[PDB]
Structures are given as C-alpha cells and as structure tokens.
Amino acid sequence: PPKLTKQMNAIIDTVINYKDSSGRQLSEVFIQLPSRKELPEYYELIRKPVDFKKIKERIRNHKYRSLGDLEKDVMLLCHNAQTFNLEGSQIYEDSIVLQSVFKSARQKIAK
Ligand SMILES: O=c1nc2n(c3cccc(Cl)c13)-c1cc(C3CCNCC3)ccc1C21CCCCC1
Ligand SMILES: [Zn+2]
Secondary structure (H helix, E strand, O other), X not given: OXXXXXXXXXXXXXXXXXXXXXXXXXXXXXXXXXXXXXXXXXXXXXXXXXXXXXXXXXXXOOOOOOHHHHHHHHXXXXXXXXXXXXXXXXXXXHHHHHHHHHHHHHHHHHX
C-alpha cells in the first residue's frame, strides 16, 4: 500500500484498538451503523451517517486525499454519535474520548 494509506490505516487502527483503563474498547459500538431498516430514526436525524467500517473502506479505496479529510470523517462520526445519543451517556462520552485519541494517534503516526 502507498505511504499515506499505511499512515491512515495505522491511525484508524490505533483509534479502533484504544481501550480505557478498565480494558474496554471504546470503538466497539461505532464499528457498524444499525441498518436503515432496523433504526430508521437514526437516519431521520443524522444527515451523513458514517461508521469505522466506512472510514476503513474510504482509506482502503484511496478516497481521502489528506489526513485532514480523514479527520473530517472521524469528527463527523463523533458528531453523529453526540447528536443521536443522550448527553452524558457512555456512548456520547466515548465519542468525545475517541476524538482526542484520533488527534493523538494522528500526531504520533504522521509526525
Ligand atoms: O451514533 C451512533 N449510535 C449508535 N451506533 C453507531 C454505530 C456506528 C457509528 C455511530 Cl456514530 C453510531 C449503533 C450501532 C449499533 C450496532 C448495529 C450493528 N449491530 C451491532 C450494534 C447499535 C446501536 C447503535 C447506536 C447507539 C445506541 C442507540 C442506537 C444507535
Ligand atoms: Zn490500492
């Protein structure tokens, strides 16, 4: 794979694998969106749905021109989680932590 592809895969794999001090993998709920037929209410509220599987697809298929474009999709995923899920819920808080994990992984891997 090209250098940018390896860097993006390392960044997103770091985010997906991140665990809190209890050993819980925070990305678990964000890997795969519920289907439109099972939870249409999600798609009525969230204009541009995205999950980590879709971000991995966009890295795999060379859709992100820059790390800024990848960051935009990660921040969109976290924005969608905060929009749909209750403030203070574990999912909402986890999405805030993952925004920080992404920024840290990006700085470490891309230098
Ligand atoms: O914003 C999200 N809220 C949610 N999800 C998400 C999945 C991927 C990305 C995002 Cl950004 C989300 C999400 C994902 C699931 C999966 C669907 C596939 N089978 C395993 C479970 C179930 C439920 C959800 C919520 C959280 C709980 C309330 C319903 C919606
Ligand atoms: Zn390729």
